[PDB]
Write an enzyme that holds these catalytic residues in place. Structure first.
Site, PDB file in Angstrom:
ATOM      1  N   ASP A 278       0.829  -1.290   0.000  1.00 48.33           N
ATOM      2  CA  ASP A 278       0.000   0.000   0.000  1.00 48.33           C
ATOM      3  C   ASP A 278       0.835   1.299   0.000  1.00 48.33           C
ATOM      4  O   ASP A 278       0.291   2.386   0.244  1.00 48.33           O
ATOM      5  CB  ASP A 278      -1.068   0.021   1.125  1.00 48.33           C
ATOM      6  CG  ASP A 278      -0.448  -0.136   2.506  1.00 48.33           C
ATOM      7  OD1 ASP A 278       0.785   0.144   2.634  1.00 48.33           O
ATOM      8  OD2 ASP A 278      -1.207  -0.417   3.481  1.00 48.33           O
TER       9      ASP A 278
ATOM     10  N   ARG B  19       1.020   6.872   0.076  1.00 50.59           N
ATOM     11  CA  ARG B  19       0.280   5.839   0.829  1.00 50.59           C
ATOM     12  C   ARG B  19      -1.157   5.817   0.226  1.00 50.59           C
ATOM     13  O   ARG B  19      -1.802   6.841   0.069  1.00 50.59           O
ATOM     14  CB  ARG B  19       0.254   6.249   2.312  1.00 50.59           C
ATOM     15  CG  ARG B  19      -0.644   5.381   3.207  1.00 50.59           C
ATOM     16  CD  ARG B  19      -0.173   3.918   3.264  1.00 50.59           C
ATOM     17  NE  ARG B  19      -0.809   3.129   4.340  1.00 50.59           N
ATOM     18  CZ  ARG B  19      -2.033   2.590   4.257  1.00 50.59           C
ATOM     19  NH1 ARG B  19      -2.733   2.668   3.112  1.00 50.59           N
ATOM     20  NH2 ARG B  19      -2.486   1.883   5.309  1.00 50.59           N
TER      21      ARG B  19
ATOM     22  N   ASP C  47      -5.688  -1.007   3.716  1.00 54.47           N
ATOM     23  CA  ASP C  47      -4.568  -1.477   4.562  1.00 54.47           C
ATOM     24  C   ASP C  47      -4.215  -2.848   4.023  1.00 54.47           C
ATOM     25  O   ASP C  47      -4.988  -3.786   4.139  1.00 54.47           O
ATOM     26  CB  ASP C  47      -4.997  -1.524   6.019  1.00 54.47           C
ATOM     27  CG  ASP C  47      -3.796  -1.690   6.983  1.00 54.47           C
ATOM     28  OD1 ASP C  47      -2.729  -1.146   6.643  1.00 54.47           O
ATOM     29  OD2 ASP C  47      -4.013  -2.329   8.062  1.00 54.47           O
ATOM     30  N   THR C  48      -3.021  -2.960   3.483  1.00 56.52           N
ATOM     31  CA  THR C  48      -2.425  -4.248   3.167  1.00 56.52           C
ATOM     32  C   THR C  48      -1.669  -4.753   4.396  1.00 56.52           C
ATOM     33  O   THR C  48      -1.152  -3.998   5.138  1.00 56.52           O
ATOM     34  CB  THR C  48      -1.454  -4.132   1.938  1.00 56.52           C
ATOM     35  OG1 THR C  48      -0.540  -3.057   2.126  1.00 56.52           O
ATOM     36  CG2 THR C  48      -2.241  -3.889   0.608  1.00 56.52           C
TER      37      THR C  48
ATOM     38  N   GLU D 237       1.608  -5.915   6.424  1.00 58.29           N
ATOM     39  CA  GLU D 237       3.042  -5.566   6.293  1.00 58.29           C
ATOM     40  C   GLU D 237       3.731  -6.777   5.617  1.00 58.29           C
ATOM     41  O   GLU D 237       3.279  -7.910   5.715  1.00 58.29           O
ATOM     42  CB  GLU D 237       3.688  -5.309   7.655  1.00 58.29           C
ATOM     43  CG  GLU D 237       3.052  -4.176   8.438  1.00 58.29           C
ATOM     44  CD  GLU D 237       3.127  -2.854   7.701  1.00 58.29           C
ATOM     45  OE1 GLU D 237       4.186  -2.572   7.103  1.00 58.29           O
ATOM     46  OE2 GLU D 237       2.136  -2.092   7.723  1.00 58.29           O
TER      47      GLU D 237
ATOM     48  N   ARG E 258       3.916  11.332   3.642  1.00 59.79           N
ATOM     49  CA  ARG E 258       3.463  10.511   2.503  1.00 59.79           C
ATOM     50  C   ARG E 258       2.311  11.188   1.846  1.00 59.79           C
ATOM     51  O   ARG E 258       1.398  11.581   2.512  1.00 59.79           O
ATOM     52  CB  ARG E 258       3.005   9.110   2.950  1.00 59.79           C
ATOM     53  CG  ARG E 258       4.172   8.419   3.673  1.00 59.79           C
ATOM     54  CD  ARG E 258       3.836   7.012   4.150  1.00 59.79           C
ATOM     55  NE  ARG E 258       2.738   6.993   5.117  1.00 59.79           N
ATOM     56  CZ  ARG E 258       2.196   5.871   5.597  1.00 59.79           C
ATOM     57  NH1 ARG E 258       2.746   4.670   5.371  1.00 59.79           N
ATOM     58  NH2 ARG E 258       1.074   5.971   6.316  1.00 59.79           N
TER      59      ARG E 258
HETATM   60  C1  LIG Z   1      -4.103   5.701   4.984  1.00 59.36           C
HETATM   61  C2  LIG Z   1      -3.778   6.754   6.004  1.00 59.36           C
HETATM   62  C3  LIG Z   1      -2.839   6.523   7.037  1.00 59.36           C
HETATM   63  N1  LIG Z   1      -2.603   7.526   7.919  1.00 59.36           N
HETATM   64  C4  LIG Z   1      -1.687   7.333   9.099  1.00 59.36           C
HETATM   65  C5  LIG Z   1      -2.554   6.702  10.199  1.00 59.36           C
HETATM   66  C6  LIG Z   1      -1.659   5.673  10.815  1.00 59.36           C
HETATM   67  O1  LIG Z   1      -0.903   6.311  11.931  1.00 59.36           O
HETATM   68  P1  LIG Z   1       0.069   5.393  12.871  1.00 59.36           P
HETATM   69  O2  LIG Z   1       1.427   5.327  12.137  1.00 59.36           O
HETATM   70  O3  LIG Z   1       0.204   6.353  14.040  1.00 59.36           O
HETATM   71  O4  LIG Z   1      -0.583   4.080  13.126  1.00 59.36           O
HETATM   72  C7  LIG Z   1      -0.696   5.282   9.709  1.00 59.36           C
HETATM   73  C8  LIG Z   1      -1.056   3.904   9.097  1.00 59.36           C
HETATM   74  O5  LIG Z   1      -0.272   3.732   7.859  1.00 59.36           O
HETATM   75  P2  LIG Z   1       0.426   2.325   7.586  1.00 59.36           P
HETATM   76  O6  LIG Z   1      -0.660   1.258   7.474  1.00 59.36           O
HETATM   77  O7  LIG Z   1       1.236   2.558   6.320  1.00 59.36           O
HETATM   78  O8  LIG Z   1       1.289   1.988   8.799  1.00 59.36           O
HETATM   79  O9  LIG Z   1      -0.834   6.277   8.739  1.00 59.36           O
HETATM   80  C9  LIG Z   1      -3.242   8.762   7.792  1.00 59.36           C
HETATM   81  O10 LIG Z   1      -2.933   9.652   8.642  1.00 59.36           O
HETATM   82  N2  LIG Z   1      -4.128   9.065   6.797  1.00 59.36           N
HETATM   83  C10 LIG Z   1      -4.397   8.066   5.890  1.00 59.36           C
HETATM   84  O11 LIG Z   1      -5.293   8.325   5.051  1.00 59.36           O
HETATM   85 CA   LIG Z   2      -0.103  -1.359   5.889  1.00 53.94          CA
END
Ligand SMILES: Cc1cn([C@H]2C[C@H](OP(=O)(O)O)[C@@H](COP(=O)(O)O)O2)c(=O)[nH]c1=O
Ligand SMILES: [Ca+2]
EC number: 3.1.31.1
Length: 129
Positions: free
Chosen positions: A15, A29, A34-35, A37, A75
């Site tokens: 993702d 991103r 959510d894929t 890890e 991102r």
């Molecule tokens: C998809 C997405 C993730 N995020 C932030 C929330 C999550 O915070 P945390 O890092 O504090 O958990 C993190 C999850 O992305 P990942 O699934 O790439 O880890 O990215 C956003 O802020 N907006 C978004 O639209």
């Molecule tokens: Ca992920």
């Protein structure tokens, strides 16, 4: 919403991808999914799926939603298209991502993706197997 040009620089995982957008390298991103890890079940499969789809594409496009365009990590947040087909939706339709992270005001394609997730779950695919 509208699609804008980008090119792939490098695949990352299911993702996230590194694209050149307006001439600058950025990690994107994927909105609303959510894929797993890479180190998780179906993580390798998801990474391979997004790698194939984006590398094989003649034309990559990014579509921002109405709200924030970058997250707290810098991102880019977008829907990504490969030869007109949305990667976000494809991942969900194959059961390699769950609909997730649906924040108010960046959720334009929420229902499209939920319909895909429903079909993937009915087919017991991958994450739903
Ligand atoms: C998809 C997405 C993730 N995020 C932030 C929330 C999550 O915070 P945390 O890092 O504090 O958990 C993190 C999850 O992305 P990942 O699934 O790439 O880890 O990215 C956003 O802020 N907006 C978004 O639209
Ligand atoms: Ca992920």
């Amino acid at each position: 919403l509208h699609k804008e040009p980008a090119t792939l620089i490098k695949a990352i995982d299911g993702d996230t991808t590194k694209l050149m957008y307006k001439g600058q390298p950025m990690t994107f991103r994927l909105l609303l999914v959510d894929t797993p890890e890479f180190n998780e079940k179906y993580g390798p499969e998801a990474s391979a799926f997004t790698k194939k789809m984006t590398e094989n594409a003649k034309k990559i496009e990014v579509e921002f939603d109405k709200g924030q365009r970058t997250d707290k990590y810098g991102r880019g947040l977008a829907y990504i298209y490969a030869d007109g087909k949305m990667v976000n939706e494809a991942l969900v339709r194959q059961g390699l991502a769950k609909v997730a992270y649906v924040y108010k005001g960046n959720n334009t394609h929420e229902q499209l993706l939920r319909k895909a997730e429903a079909q993937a779950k009915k087919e017991k695919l991958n994450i739903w197997s």
